[PDB]
Design a protein around this nucleic acid. Structure first.
Ligand SMILES: [Mg+2]
Ligand SMILES: [Mg+2]
Ligand SMILES: [Mg+2]
Ligand SMILES: [Mg+2]
Ligand SMILES: [Mg+2]
Ligand SMILES: [Mg+2]
Ligand SMILES: [Mg+2]
Ligand SMILES: [Mg+2]
Ligand SMILES: [Mg+2]
Ligand SMILES: [Mg+2]
Ligand SMILES: [Mg+2]
Ligand SMILES: [Mg+2]
Ligand SMILES: [Mg+2]
Ligand SMILES: [Mg+2]
Ligand SMILES: [Mg+2]
Ligand SMILES: [Mg+2]
Ligand SMILES: [Mg+2]
Ligand SMILES: [Mg+2]
Ligand SMILES: [Mg+2]
Ligand SMILES: [Mg+2]
Ligand SMILES: [Mg+2]
Ligand SMILES: [Mg+2]
Ligand SMILES: [Mg+2]
Ligand SMILES: [Mg+2]
Ligand SMILES: [Mg+2]
Ligand SMILES: [Mg+2]
Ligand SMILES: [Mg+2]
Ligand SMILES: [Mg+2]
Ligand SMILES: [Mg+2]
Ligand SMILES: [Mg+2]
Ligand SMILES: [Mg+2]
Lengths: 53, 148, 147, 124, 53, 187, 53, 128
RNA sequence: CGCUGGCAGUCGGCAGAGCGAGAAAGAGAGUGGCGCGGACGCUACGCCGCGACGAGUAGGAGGGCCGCUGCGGUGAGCCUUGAAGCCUAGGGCGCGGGCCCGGGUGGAGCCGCCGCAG
RNA sequence: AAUGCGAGUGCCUAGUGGGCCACUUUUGGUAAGCAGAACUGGCGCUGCGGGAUGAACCGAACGCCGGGUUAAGGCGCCCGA
RNA sequence: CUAAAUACCGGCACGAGACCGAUAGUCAACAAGUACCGUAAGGGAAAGUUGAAAAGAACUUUGAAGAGAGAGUUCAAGAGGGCGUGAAACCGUUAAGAGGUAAACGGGUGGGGUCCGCGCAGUCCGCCCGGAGGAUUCAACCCGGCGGCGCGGUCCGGCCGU
């Protein structure tokens, strides 16, 4: 990525769109984890409407 | 259905047959109920009629979703800024037309009522012609118990 | 890929996407540019204004090579020479001005559109425009004509 | 990375079977044998495999060491557990929990190890 | 005179060469091609120059 | 039944990128997690712009980047680009710039790194500022494409400067009847 | 990434020799199976022979 | 000694008859396989009373009991012995059908392995 | 169809198990007065939860683990201990296009998955 | 002011360009299941309950089902009441 | 006057194919520009497959014979000289059911059949308790091997750094 191809005229290695691709280690990093809200993992299913009358 | 009448029936939120809604009355409301007069049957509800309607068919419009009013938190989360925090506050603001009647009435979903038990008299004619359409003043409660 | 085309989803539908009343006939309005005056006049006037008629003088044996005059603006004037040509004059103290030959880079006329950096130039060109030479004189420079 | 090569192998792998509205994987270290990111036995740096022994009895537990990742000859360590049905279930659970080695596969390893021991019993 | 042949940009051909070469040094990607390389000592398998002889 | 109209029930908008490239699809996973797990609206805009087509993320010129980061108040900030940062060669001085983009061209990268700034990717931006704080979102000119000169009111209509579709331009290519007061009329 | 390891050159007998070559930067290029498929299925049409009735 | 599934819920099917093609009874050239009628005057696609019904989406089976055999299992097609170690961890919800082109010699070995792996075979006495 | 809804928190003896609640924001840090144990999950193109809705000619769009033929890869795929094809008051799956098994007939080739092409 | 509803905007674009019927208004004609208009709703494109039958009338519009209740119509027998 | 680079669905000799597979592909896979038609110019088909090997059914018997019945060949005549596989339309016979609003159909049941469940004493799984048994057996220690982790706050040595 710093030295061009010598047997080709003008070719370089292509650039990376995403350097660190291990998004598991990206996501469970303390930099990201502190700037998150609490997870809402409680399932609230529908309530059978009883007649109050 | 005529287009002018379709627009008023949508502004009254009556998009389906046997739907019911609470409307406060003034000149601007009577002149719209006159336009939709042969297609509706309106009247003056009792306090027990409001109690039956809000307790049995009361659904709230919360995040554009028809949510059953099974707990007072559901009312208090949306109408709590107008000091309406329970079923009793909702019934009070509906029955006595208060300051936040527009918000309290628009929070309620339009009432999805059944077919009238016993039967209709005549759908196509006015109430004073021995039918059903138009203004039945004290007799909307008799339809409310058989339709609710 | 014929498997991605519309024809494979049109098997079973009788008119093949072309209508029951107005069928897919062969040429129901003429062939090609037919009826530009008569029955496609609204399209030809609403989308192709000026299509009918004669404008201007004729030139019989026109060869494009005589009027060859490629142009470069002054905002591209410093891209024709190398970067160490430009920065050496910036670090230079004797006031020597680099020479840009635009005919060598393949341009004949210099037009003046963009800015010039505050440093002297000697631009050799076949043609110059007025604002191009005044933007070179204002930054301090020479406009040398070549043939 | 594991996610990066999962995005390659999620649909065009040679271990993938897609028939009868189900999907699986014939991968060597895929315990539960299903095609998923968590259970894939070759994209991860730490994998656990539970297989039957070469002879009739025993359960072979295979891990992947962290050092040789591009070196598949010496990458996997293998142990043979020819014991009773309960101490192997304590042993594999210890090997995962105490070593903290890919801890979300412990009950899957125990459920595979129970099935191998059930399969090595005499049939009725 | 159907268009039998397609032309591909040289930079994309080289890019595909780089993507195919970089995928051949990864374990899971060559396993998922089905090659039996469980006992291969190193995945960039490099040998000496007397093999050409 | 109800008398509602189902014409506009399905909104057309993008839920996912149409592209199948797996490096973009991992950044989509990252910012999809971030947009729902943070209350920052920056991650929502970045995630929505990652879905978009190539014409909906036009490239920025370096000169437009210099002028949009030269504004007062926005010093020492990260310019965030969803499209491509291309070089603009009609500018001589490049100050240092902290850059986050999907793509940076090879000659713009050299000029930025020679100026002394940094070029990040979007995973690096997610690690640095997870909520995108101290950032300036930028986008290219969307009407910069040549396709938009042929759009609008039709040519051959009064007060419509719309470019027509011609096979070539010249003296005798649509310049006579709808264009001259001499020949016919002029709109 | 950027970390280029040191691959070992193996002898013809299968054991490692003393020679080590650093990993070329080609093997850290991005993996794009969509572009590899696009290049392959367009360049594979170029060896075809015409057929006609 | 039958192999029970994990659960056996009650299977509700909204329709058990096939959806036969319109006028597949007056002709042999018209097969039983369903074709949606698209005629201008067709009394079947206009949903006239007392005619052949059309396969709408409302007839769709419950997703919990969809593709499930009356024994309570779902089915997987198996060609060789190696495809059973695929199914051993999906044991109490998916069962095996040996494919028709598998010979009897290998079909004996498949059901022999399925017996010790406790995988149910829908056709264990198939060829012999 | 919408909520451009929720889940990377499976954070475990380097542990402390939560974000449904009417009321913008932190179960924050410091500074002074025995028993070795804990179901499932997550093909994130996946899984899950709330509501509302469902006519259709001409026509348009999307999804097909619907179907036919051939090619590049791939199933240490199937096969004279019986392939393709055909027949069947047999057992089934799928809303459907269709498909898988059982029996018979037959005697030599055939299919699944990822892409490509007509 | 009341009531109600998330809106705004840009490309590309098929089919169609024979229509017909009804309350009211209305032209020509003795009149027409005639010819020609305005408004709205239908049929065409649409099944269902009723008018015995039935393009348009009355009611009501349609995913697959169970329970309950109705509309317009009916309740001697056909034929539910 | 003048070579070369350029053209080539005819001819001779070749090679190949993401082409077609006997209603396809040339009209023509075969005694095909043949049989046949038209005075003529011209028009112009249909038509592949026993078996591995003819081993192509000797002999007995009825009939004038075509045809059968035995016998025999073959892995197989359920391959018998237009013979591989042998569908549908149509027909013969057997078996079952039915029958005065032409037949057929959709929904809902009922009856009779044909087969299937290889049904006909009815599911196992985990823990605990009790009772009869059997092992070369548990924990804890010792030795050796392997693996994981190490903020070994900062142990020694290497490798890499868009
Ligand atoms: Mg009653
Ligand atoms: Mg009326
Ligand atoms: Mg259509
Ligand atoms: Mg037609
Ligand atoms: Mg069309
Ligand atoms: Mg037309
Ligand atoms: Mg056309
Ligand atoms: Mg004219
Ligand atoms: Mg509906
Ligand atoms: Mg619709
Ligand atoms: Mg729409
Ligand atoms: Mg019609
Ligand atoms: Mg529909
Ligand atoms: Mg049959
Ligand atoms: Mg017409
Ligand atoms: Mg008329
Ligand atoms: Mg319509
Ligand atoms: Mg209608
Ligand atoms: Mg009548
Ligand atoms: Mg009902
Ligand atoms: Mg009657
Ligand atoms: Mg000459
Ligand atoms: Mg060749
Ligand atoms: Mg032929
Ligand atoms: Mg044939
Ligand atoms: Mg034949
Ligand atoms: Mg045979
Ligand atoms: Mg035969
Ligand atoms: Mg043969
Ligand atoms: Mg035959
Ligand atoms: Mg009989």
């Amino acid at each position: 990525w710093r030295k061009a191809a010598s047997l080709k005229s003008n070719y370089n290695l292509p650039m990376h769109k995403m350097l660190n691709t291990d998004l598991s280690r990206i996501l469970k990093s303390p930099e990201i984890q502190r700037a998150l809200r609490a997870p809402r993992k409680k399932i609230h299913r529908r309530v059978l409407k009883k007649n109050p009358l | 259905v005529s287009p002018k009448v379709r627009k008023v029936l949508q502004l009254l939120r009556l998009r389906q047959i046997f739907n019911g809604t609470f409307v406060k009355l003034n000149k601007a409301s009577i002149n719209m109920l006159r336009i939709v007069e042969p297609y509706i049957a309106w009247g003056y509800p009792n306090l027990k009629s409001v109690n039956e309607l809000i307790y049995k068919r009361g659904y709230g419009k919360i995040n554009k979703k028809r949510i059953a009013l099974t707990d007072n938190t559901l009312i208090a989360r949306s109408l709590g800024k107008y000091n309406i925090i329970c079923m009793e506050d909702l019934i009070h603001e509906i029955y006595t037309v208060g300051k936040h009647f527009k918000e309290a009435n628009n929070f309620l979903w339009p009432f999805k009522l059944s077919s009238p038990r016993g039967g209709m008299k005549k759908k196509t004619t006015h109430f004073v012609e021995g039918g059903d359409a138009g203004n039945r003043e004290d007799q909307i409660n008799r339809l409310i118990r058989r339709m609710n | 890929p014929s498997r991605l085309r519309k024809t494979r989803k049109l098997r079973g539908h009788v008119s093949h996407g072309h209508g029951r009343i107005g069928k897919h006939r062969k040429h129901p309005g003429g062939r090609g540019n037919a009826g530009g005056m008569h029955h496609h006049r609204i399209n030809f006037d609403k989308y192709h204004p000026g299509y009918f008629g004669k404008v201007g003088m004729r030139h019989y044996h026109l060869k494009r090579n005589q009027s060859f005059c490629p142009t470069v603006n002054l905002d591209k004037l410093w891209t024709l020479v190398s970067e160490q040509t430009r920065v050496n004059a910036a670090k230079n103290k004797t006031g020597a001005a680099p020479i840009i030959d635009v005919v060598r880079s393949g341009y004949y006329k210099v037009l003046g559109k963009g800015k010039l950096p505050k440093q002297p130039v000697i631009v050799k060109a076949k043609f110059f425009s007025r604002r191009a030479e005044e933007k070179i004189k204002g930054v301090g420079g020479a406009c040398v004509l070549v043939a | 990375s594991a996610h990066l090569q999962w995005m390659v192998v999620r649909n065009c792998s040679s271990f993938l079977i897609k028939r009868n509205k189900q999907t699986y994987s014939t991968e060597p270290n895929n315990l539960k044998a299903r095609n998923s990111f968590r259970y894939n036995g070759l994209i991860h740096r730490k994998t656990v495999g539970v297989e039957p022994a070469a002879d009739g009895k025993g359960v072979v537990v295979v891990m992947k060491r962290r050092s040789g990742q591009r070196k598949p000859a010496t990458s996997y360590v293998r142990t043979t557990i020819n014991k009773n049905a309960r101490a192997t279930l304590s042993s594999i659970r210890h090997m995962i929990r105490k070593n903290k080695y890919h801890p979300d596969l412990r009950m899957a390893a125990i459920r595979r190890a129970s099935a191998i021991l059930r399969s090595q019993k005499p049939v009725m | 005179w159907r268009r039998w042949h397609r032309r591909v940009n040289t930079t994309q051909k080289r890019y595909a060469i780089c993507s195919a070469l970089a995928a051949s040094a990864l374990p899971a990607l060559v396993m998922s091609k089905g090659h039996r390389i469980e006992e291969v000592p190193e995945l960039p398998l490099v040998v000496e120059d007397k093999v050409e002889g | 039944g109800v008398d509602i109209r189902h014409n506009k029930d399905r909104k057309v908008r993008r839920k996912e990128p149409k592209s199948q490239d797996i490096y973009l699809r991992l950044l989509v996973k990252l910012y999809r997690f971030l947009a729902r797990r943070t209350n920052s609206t920056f991650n929502q805009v970045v995630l929505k712009r990652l879905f978009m087509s190539r014409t909906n993320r036009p490239p920025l010129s370096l000169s437009r980047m210099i002028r949009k980061m030269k504004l007062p108040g926005r010093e020492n900030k990260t310019a965030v680009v969803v499209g491509t940062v291309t070089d603009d060669v009609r500018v001589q001085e490049v100050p240092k710039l902290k850059v986050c983009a999907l793509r940076v061209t090879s000659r713009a990268r050299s000029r930025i790194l020679k100026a002394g700034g940094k070029i990040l990717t979007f995973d690096q931006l997610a690690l640095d500022s997870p909520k995108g704080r101290g950032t300036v979102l930028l986008s290219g000119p969307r009407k910069g494409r040549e396709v938009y000169r042929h759009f609008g009111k039709a040519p051959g209509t009064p007060h419509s400067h719309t470019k027509p579709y011609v096979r070539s331009k010249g003296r005798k290519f649509e310049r006579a009847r709808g264009r001259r007061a001499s020949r016919g009329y002029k709109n | 990434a950027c970390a280029r390891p040191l691959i070992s050159v193996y002898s013809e007998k299968g054991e490692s020799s003393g020679k080590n070559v650093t990993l070329p930067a080609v093997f850290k290029a991005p993996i794009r199976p969509d572009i590899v498929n696009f290049v392959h299925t367009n360049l594979r049409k170029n060896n075809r022979q015409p057929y006609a009735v | 000694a039958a192999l029970r599934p994990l659960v056996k819920p009650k299977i509700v099917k909204k329709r058990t008859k096939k959806f036969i093609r319109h006028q597949s009874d007056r002709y042999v050239k018209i097969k039983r396989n369903w074709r949606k009628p698209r005629g201008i005057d067709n009394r079947v696609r206009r949903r006239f009373k007392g005619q052949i019904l059309m396969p709408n989406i409302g007839y769709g089976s419950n997703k919990k009991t969809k593709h499930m055999l009356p024994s309570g299992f779902r089915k997987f097609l198996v060609h060789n012995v190696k495809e059973l170690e695929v199914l051993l961890m999906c044991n109490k919800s998916y069962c095996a059908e040996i494919a028709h082109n598998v010979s009897s010699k290998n079909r004996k070995a498949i059901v022999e392995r399925a017996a010790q792996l406790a995988i149910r075979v829908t056709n264990p006495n198939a060829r012999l």
